[PDB]
Amino acid sequence: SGAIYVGNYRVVNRHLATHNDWANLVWEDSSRDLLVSSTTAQGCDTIARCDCQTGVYYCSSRRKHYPVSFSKPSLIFVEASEYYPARYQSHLMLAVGHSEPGDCGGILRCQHGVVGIVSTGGNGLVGFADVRDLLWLDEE
Ligand SMILES: NC(=O)[C@H]1CCCN(C(=O)c2ccnc3[nH]ncc23)C1
Ligand SMILES: [Zn+2]
């Protein structure tokens, strides 16, 4: 589990969104595994605006932050799970790291700020849903 709290937005994995998220919806994209809902309180996370390919992510199944090298956001084949059928997920970045069921939502961050959230795992891989192109997270 986990979210990005930027301005009056909450950024979560679409597959983990709550009823309150759906009742306060700003934007959702199944192809990216992302959903954004509105918040009453202002958050403290800042979004990175960059093409960093190194950073650090939080792994809840280890209680550890790991430094990683990750691929540029791409259209990556993702295997069928309890949340989605076999499909191409867009804006996904891959790294080598521990990610098991429950690690989705952990933040990936670089020197500039938050890059994305854990969205895939297994096989000693971890995938991150990129948020750096969502410029609207910074206003309104
Ligand atoms: N965005 C998606 O389509 C996700 C949905 C959750 C599952 N998933 C994984 O890649 C995954 C996550 C955690 N541990 C794992 N072990 N084996 C596979 C996995 C795909
Ligand atoms: Zn950066």
Ligand 1 atom with least separation from CA of 119: 1
d(CA 118, CA 112): 18
**Residue 33 and residue 29: Cα distance in Å, rounded?**
6
**Experimental method for this entry?**
X-ray
With a 6 Å cutoff on the Cβ, whether 78 touches ligand 1 is yes
Sketch the domain layout of the chain as residue ranges.
3-44, 45-140
- CA 128 to the chain's CA centroid: 5
Compute, in angstroms, the gap from residue 108 CA to the centroid of ligand 2. Answer: 10
Q: Helix (H, G, I), strand (E, B), or coil: what is residue 122?
A: coil
How far apart, in whole angstroms, are the C-alpha atoms of residue 140 and residue 135? 11
Q: Output the six-digit token pair for 116.
A: 């994305």
| Residue 40 and residue 13 in contact, taking contact as beta carbons nearer than 8 Å | no
- Pick from 49, 56, 129, 59: nearest CA to 94: 129
Judge contact between 17 and 35, C-beta under 8 A: yes
The resolution, in angstroms to one decimal, equals 1.2
What is the H or E stretch that residue 139 is in?
none
Beta carbon of 128 within 6 Å of any ligand 1 atom = no
